[PDB]
RNA sequence: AGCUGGAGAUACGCUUUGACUCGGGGAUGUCCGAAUGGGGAAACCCACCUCGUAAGAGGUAUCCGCAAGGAUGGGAACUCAGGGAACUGAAACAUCUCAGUACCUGAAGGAGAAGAAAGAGAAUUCGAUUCCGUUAGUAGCGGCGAGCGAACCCGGAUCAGCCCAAACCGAAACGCUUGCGUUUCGGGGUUGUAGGACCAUCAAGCCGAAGUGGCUGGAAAGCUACACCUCAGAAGGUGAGAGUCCUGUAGGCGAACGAGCCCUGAGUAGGUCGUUGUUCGUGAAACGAUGACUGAAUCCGCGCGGACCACCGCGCAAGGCUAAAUACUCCCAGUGACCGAUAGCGCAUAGUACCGUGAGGGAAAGGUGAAAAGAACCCCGGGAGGGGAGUGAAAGAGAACCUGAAACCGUGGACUUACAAGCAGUCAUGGCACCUUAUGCGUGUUAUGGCGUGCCUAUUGAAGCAUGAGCCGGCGACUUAGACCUGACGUGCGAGCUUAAGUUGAAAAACGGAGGCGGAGCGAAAGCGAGUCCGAAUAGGGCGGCAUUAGUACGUCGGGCUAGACUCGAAACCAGGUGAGCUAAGCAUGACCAGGUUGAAACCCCCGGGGGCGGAGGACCGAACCGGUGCCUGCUGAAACAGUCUCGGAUGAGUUGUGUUUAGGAGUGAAAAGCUAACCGAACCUGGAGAUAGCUAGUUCUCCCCGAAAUGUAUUGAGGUACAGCCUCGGAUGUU
RNA sequence: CAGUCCGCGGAGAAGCCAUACCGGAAGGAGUGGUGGAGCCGACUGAAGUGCGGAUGCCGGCAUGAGUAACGAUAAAAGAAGUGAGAAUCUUCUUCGCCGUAAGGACAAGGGUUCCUGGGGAAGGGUCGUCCGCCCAGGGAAAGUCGGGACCUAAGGUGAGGCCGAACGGCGCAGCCGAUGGACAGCAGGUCAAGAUUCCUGCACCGAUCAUGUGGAGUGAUGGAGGGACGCAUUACGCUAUCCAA
RNA sequence: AGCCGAAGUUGGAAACGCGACGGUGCCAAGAAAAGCUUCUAAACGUUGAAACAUGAUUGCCCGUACCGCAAACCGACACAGGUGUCCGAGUGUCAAUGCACUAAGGCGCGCGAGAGAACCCUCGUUAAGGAACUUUGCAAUCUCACCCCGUAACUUCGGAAGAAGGGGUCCCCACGCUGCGUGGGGCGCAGUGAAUAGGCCCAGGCGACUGUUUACCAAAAUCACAGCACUCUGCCAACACGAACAGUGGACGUAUAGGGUGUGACGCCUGCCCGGUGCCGGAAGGUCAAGUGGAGCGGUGCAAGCUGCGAAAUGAAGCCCCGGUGAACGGCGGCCUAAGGUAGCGAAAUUCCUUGUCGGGUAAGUUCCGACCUGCACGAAAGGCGUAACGAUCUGGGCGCUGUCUCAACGAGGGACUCGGUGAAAUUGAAUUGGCUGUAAAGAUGCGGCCUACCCGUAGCAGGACGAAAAGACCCCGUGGAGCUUUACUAUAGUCUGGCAUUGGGAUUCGGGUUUCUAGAAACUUGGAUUUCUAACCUGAAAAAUCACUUUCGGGGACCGUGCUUGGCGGG
RNA sequence: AGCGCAAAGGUAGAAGGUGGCUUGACUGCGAGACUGACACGUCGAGCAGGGAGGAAACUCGGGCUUAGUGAACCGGUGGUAC
């Protein structure tokens, strides 16, 4: 379970492979011919707090820890 | 005052110092199971620690926390959430739909969800959330196709908003060059017409009014002559139909214990890239929503008003809790133009029997009689069965026990039949029999004469040697739904007509105008308006006048739509499971292969050759065993793949046990698409699911009237559809 | 089926059964016969409302028909018994058939089928007095055999640990897991029915304790050895066991 | 044994069992773990040890009946089927678990009795002939074990080989040797006297071979096989299973190894053609995404400003382009294409015309064999030509013997038939069910005429009832289905590639930024680029096997791996 | 004979041939009919605004006629100001 700590998440969403694209450049106007389901997750960190262990820490997360420790410490 | 479970059976007994039975608590509660001392193939194995006499009792899993003390699992449908189909429609099919449906998985409760506006929205209104009606198939989305489809206003059901961070005091512990600031505790402080700081009853139950004589009968409750009670004539039982026999009902009481109302939230608002929800399919695409990378502002401040800008309005996000109206119905009561033994739940009980290795599938159901009085006794027979006798109203009820239809099997009697040719009959005549709707224009039968191609379906055409069908019974197919569209008929009111949700009553229905339809049309729309669009003015289209054709709420019915949509019937597709106990291989570990033949190296002598010696081999022959080569038999089998005989191997790439692993587009395969539990070019089961079926078959009571078509054009069309053509019903017209 | 009337009915309802009667038809009456407890007629309302067909469904009964067969061509015959009844059950004497089996012992797997006494419906391809069928009652004995209170292979688990929309997928040690390693008795007797179990004879094993010798070193979840393993052939002795006189 | 209890000898045979964990040879190199024996660590003591002897005491749980190659298990059954392990006597026969008889033990298979028709199944003998039969000698003969003698073309020297072919086989006696051999006699038709117990030869095709296969219509020339070849893969290897920076297999292997593909022992060999396609190299140039850039074109505001578009240049792989590669996909012909057939073979498993022509073999040869070549439409590792041996392989021939046949006959048994007991089935519109000829949907019992036919059975046959069975698997149709294919379409696991994050100091060349100063350079970068560094990360060694710690530590390294996004490849 | 291409009709007072002028190869309409199941298609007097030729009557909203063609959706370009 990709569960990144604090904010936790993995999502998933359906895609489009769309035709010869002009949309409002002209008449060809995206035949979309591509319907299917994908996903996406994240990577890992080390962290501490109360006393020190080792978890999957999102990079948005990373950030936020480089600013201070939020609940628990970097 | 009986009790001693169904259970019907004997014996043993308990009870008026209160049984039983009924309500309420207590106390015991073996083992499995979340199972939890440890193991495990559930219900069985094997331990340890304290009590310590012993029999016996208690503890010994993991997760959160110091510590109390929580949690694990289960629950029919209902809820929310993480994933997320495919048949199907589109008459093909990708976007689309089918659908966030089915299904899986998680959390939880009697509900849940959601919820107290950085909102809807366009009046400078609204003021939480949920639900119904409606707005409305309006807006809108859509290969702009099939189709998909809001929200606000308004009307109801229910209506409660409450709490914390943060500026500031008191620290206290700790952080630094010296009356200061990271997270903890009390005070205080909760916002937009900006707020806030700091300075001016139901349970178990009891009581409960009132009828007797005669008659029929086996029996009284029926009939009958007189009565009585009624805050009670709801109902059920009693030998048949009971207000007054019972139990009840109306009414009334009813309990020790019993349930139940200077601050205001940042790694975020915002953005780019991928995407998505509401009607939102990149469309001009706002907004929310998040994966990746980034990254503001403070009250002269921030978000929205559907690209974007200014103005003008609505609102303060990034912290939380929150009943009720709402959903379901495992369970209880009540009720029914619901069923009544093929119906109705599968079950008048049984998820049993039975089928399956399994997941899972899955039945038939019934009837003495009032009461057992359930047939003493005798007869024939081992019986079984039966005849008497009794019981009983009935034994024309006797336990194969209500009725007891049809097929089908028999016994007896009338008439008939052994030179006859035959869809089984039809009319006629004669012969015989009989006379209970019946001496006749008779009933049963019969001889001879004439006549005469079963039924249905599908058809140009059916006796067909075209389909279906053994026979009788019984189940068995044009339905339901909706504030839908359209027509006919009928009724109320009528230039008006009517409610929906609901509210109050219910042995009964009234209220409820939100809302719908008529009233004006033309236009692409702005918009004009009995006129209107086209246009530069005149020519037209639709429209009113005129015939002002009257509408609307219901009921019934003909059609239409949408949904299984007249019933049955696919081969398939998808989802989540169940299966390697068959078979296809692997792995671990054990075991098996009579006997006989041949005589490789190597080693040792005589000159690669001879001798010895030795005992090798995917060597030879042949039993087990493993295998199936050819004929025959078997062919409603002895057997759902065999048997006799014959044949392949038979120390190797061998056979075989146990245990075990590998599976559904997947496994395995010395390779046939072979095997995967006896139908494998994609198993089985449950489900989606009544998939779709332009294809087939089937669609039952009667009579009256009318009466066709197999043509034309169009078509991923030709055996199918659309529009004409032809039929019919009604209205008008009025001889066309 | 429902509402409302009219009524009927143990001197007998519906239903069933005959029937020459009646209406234009779907149909409906009269009378008789069963039956034995509910039901007709009229008006209205609602329907799961009219069957010959669907290789339709549930059911019963036909035809084929007293036909094919009676499940290996290892044959059977006489006496005698029992008995309601015997080609078939019991016994006796011949006969024939298997004999690396068609004998015996186990494992599975089945579950009382075992033994005794009884029974005769149905199951037994005929019969049946019999049975592996029905009824009732007995039989099943372990310190040493197999397993367990021991061990490990594959495999399965699995605190920690590695991953993963969820459910979960892995995963070191350890643990489970015999098909393998380890380990103490044999000979005999016998219920109707049990046997290395019970009884008889005499052994072994471990454990506790006592008496004594000895009268002091024991000596781990750790080290080490060993347990510890293939195939084909083949020399020597021997037993089981069978042959001869 | 026996009528309570006798005897228990001599000689021989002999296990897979025991001694044993024996010897020897081989290569494919053959579990783990506790019990067990031996050591100390800690601890307990060293005048109530370890051990031994005797006595006593203790000995828990589960299983055990019966069936158990089958009437009690799996086959819906008292089922001709299967079912793992162990023991399985004797006589004779070289041997044996074989064959025949039989011990022990066990059983006659749960309808019987007649009769001796057709027909049918399993069988015995058969005149004369002998394959004439027929698709084919299919089937049934014939051959038959042991011993002696004798055996070809060919050969990979091993084999073909049991080649072929001939001879013996029994009983008695004497003699020799360790039951054989030597002589003699004897009996029959006959001497492996009965049972088990090879027909053989010549010549092809295909495949070398043993082997493997379509449970249940195909066992082969299919498949695999050693051998060969291409090609990849440097070790967290290529490659595969997988929500996965998880974990595994490859592999506790490491280029003499591992993966894939195709040929398919051995022998001689394997020619021509890089044009397309694939792939491997190159990478002057053409084109090519996001991204960097944002010059300009517009809205909207009085304006500040906000905001919609938006070029040029610069942007990777990849494709176009240029070489090459064949034991890569392939091509090697029609009165210009990249070439046009090297050897070898050829009327073929490939030959249409086709029974090609000639020869061979038979009286007669569409077959077959050998030559020829006019190869419709051979050919070189989708291998070409041979090959000994091998085959339940296919084809042609010949010997041998046969009831396959001319041509059937007689006999046996199990049915079939008759009587008694039990007693089904597929089927079935209903049947009072004839012949001809005509007619009708065009094949008449059923319509017309004409003929024939008393009622009913029973044993038989197989013309009719378009007989029976499975709503034709062939054909067509359905805007049905499914499996498979590819340069049909569309996507997409996977996979390559640029940019952003994980992700960092620094030197080094910097197209450029700012305030810095006599066109200029120090503080300094925003980046890019090689190069280098060790704190991120990955990985490995040490009592602590996976994991965490530490590591005198060791290597890589800001790449690899992973997240988003870009563009390509993508019948898997 | 000819009539741009195929043929039938038609045509000698021209539709054939040859010049001058110019664009009616117009915008807005459409009484009436032909034809088709629809949907399309054909012919069309005359009115407006304004042109062109002719001295005028008059003739022009294509070619002697009959073929020279594709609804609908989705888009490009110019106007318009819903
Ligand atoms: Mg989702
Ligand atoms: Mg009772
Ligand atoms: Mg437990
Ligand atoms: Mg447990
Ligand atoms: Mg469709
Ligand atoms: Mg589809
Ligand atoms: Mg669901
Ligand atoms: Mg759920
Ligand atoms: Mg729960
Ligand atoms: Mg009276
Ligand atoms: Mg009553
Ligand atoms: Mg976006
Ligand atoms: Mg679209
Ligand atoms: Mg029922
Ligand atoms: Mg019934
Ligand atoms: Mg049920
Ligand atoms: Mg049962
Ligand atoms: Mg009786
Ligand atoms: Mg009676
Ligand atoms: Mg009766
Ligand atoms: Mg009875
Ligand atoms: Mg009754
Ligand atoms: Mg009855
Ligand atoms: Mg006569
Ligand atoms: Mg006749
Ligand atoms: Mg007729
Ligand atoms: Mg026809
Ligand atoms: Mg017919
Ligand atoms: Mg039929
Ligand atoms: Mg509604
Ligand atoms: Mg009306
Ligand atoms: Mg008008
Ligand atoms: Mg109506
Ligand atoms: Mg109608
Ligand atoms: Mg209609
Ligand atoms: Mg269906
Ligand atoms: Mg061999
Ligand atoms: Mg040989
Ligand atoms: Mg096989
Ligand atoms: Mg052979
Ligand atoms: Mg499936
Ligand atoms: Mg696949
Ligand atoms: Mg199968
Ligand atoms: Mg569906
Ligand atoms: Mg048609
Ligand atoms: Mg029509
Ligand atoms: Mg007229
Ligand atoms: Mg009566
Ligand atoms: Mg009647
Ligand atoms: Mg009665
Ligand atoms: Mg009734
Ligand atoms: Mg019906
Ligand atoms: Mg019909
Ligand atoms: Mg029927
Ligand atoms: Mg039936
Ligand atoms: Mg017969
Ligand atoms: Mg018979
Ligand atoms: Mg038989
Ligand atoms: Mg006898
Ligand atoms: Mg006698
Ligand atoms: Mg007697
Ligand atoms: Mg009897
Ligand atoms: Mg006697
Ligand atoms: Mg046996
Ligand atoms: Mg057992
Ligand atoms: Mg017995
Ligand atoms: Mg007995
Ligand atoms: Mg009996
Ligand atoms: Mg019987
Ligand atoms: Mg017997
Ligand atoms: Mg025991
Ligand atoms: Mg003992
Ligand atoms: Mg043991
Ligand atoms: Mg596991
Ligand atoms: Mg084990
Ligand atoms: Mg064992
Ligand atoms: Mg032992
Ligand atoms: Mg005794
Ligand atoms: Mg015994
Ligand atoms: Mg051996
Ligand atoms: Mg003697
Ligand atoms: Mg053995
Ligand atoms: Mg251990
Ligand atoms: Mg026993
Ligand atoms: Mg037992
Ligand atoms: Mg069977
Ligand atoms: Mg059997
Ligand atoms: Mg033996
Ligand atoms: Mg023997
Ligand atoms: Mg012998
Ligand atoms: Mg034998
Ligand atoms: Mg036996
Ligand atoms: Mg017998
Ligand atoms: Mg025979
Ligand atoms: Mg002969
Ligand atoms: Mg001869
Ligand atoms: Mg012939
Ligand atoms: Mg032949
Ligand atoms: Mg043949
Ligand atoms: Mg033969
Ligand atoms: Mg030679
Ligand atoms: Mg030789
Ligand atoms: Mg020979
Ligand atoms: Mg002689
Ligand atoms: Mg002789
Ligand atoms: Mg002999
Ligand atoms: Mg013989
Ligand atoms: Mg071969
Ligand atoms: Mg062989
Ligand atoms: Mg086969
Ligand atoms: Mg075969
Ligand atoms: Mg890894
Ligand atoms: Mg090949
Ligand atoms: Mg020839
Ligand atoms: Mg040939
Ligand atoms: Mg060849
Ligand atoms: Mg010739
Ligand atoms: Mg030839
Ligand atoms: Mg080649
Ligand atoms: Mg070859
Ligand atoms: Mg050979
Ligand atoms: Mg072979
Ligand atoms: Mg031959
Ligand atoms: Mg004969
Ligand atoms: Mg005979
Ligand atoms: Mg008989
Ligand atoms: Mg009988
Ligand atoms: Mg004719
Ligand atoms: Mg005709
Ligand atoms: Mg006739
Ligand atoms: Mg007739
Ligand atoms: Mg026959
Ligand atoms: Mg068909
Ligand atoms: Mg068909
Ligand atoms: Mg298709
Ligand atoms: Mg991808
Ligand atoms: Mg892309
Ligand atoms: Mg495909
Ligand atoms: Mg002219
Ligand atoms: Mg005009
Ligand atoms: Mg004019
Ligand atoms: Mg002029
Ligand atoms: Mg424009």
Same mark, same amino acid.
């Given at each position: 379970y990709?569960?990144?700590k604090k904010n936790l998440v993995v999502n998933s969403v359906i895609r489009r492979g769309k035709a010869?694209?002009? /949309?409002? *450049?002209?008449r060809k106007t995206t035949? &979309?011919?591509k319907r299917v389901q994908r996903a996406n997750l994240h990577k890992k960190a080390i962290r501490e707090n109360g006393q020190v262990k080792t *978890?999957?820490? $999102?990079?948005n997360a990373l950030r936020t820890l $480089?600013? /201070?420790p939020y609940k /628990? &410490?970097?």
């Open positions: 990709l569960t990144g010869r694209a002009d /949309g409002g *450049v002209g035949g &979309i011919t *978890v999957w820490l $999102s990079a $480089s600013k /201070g /628990g &410490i970097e």
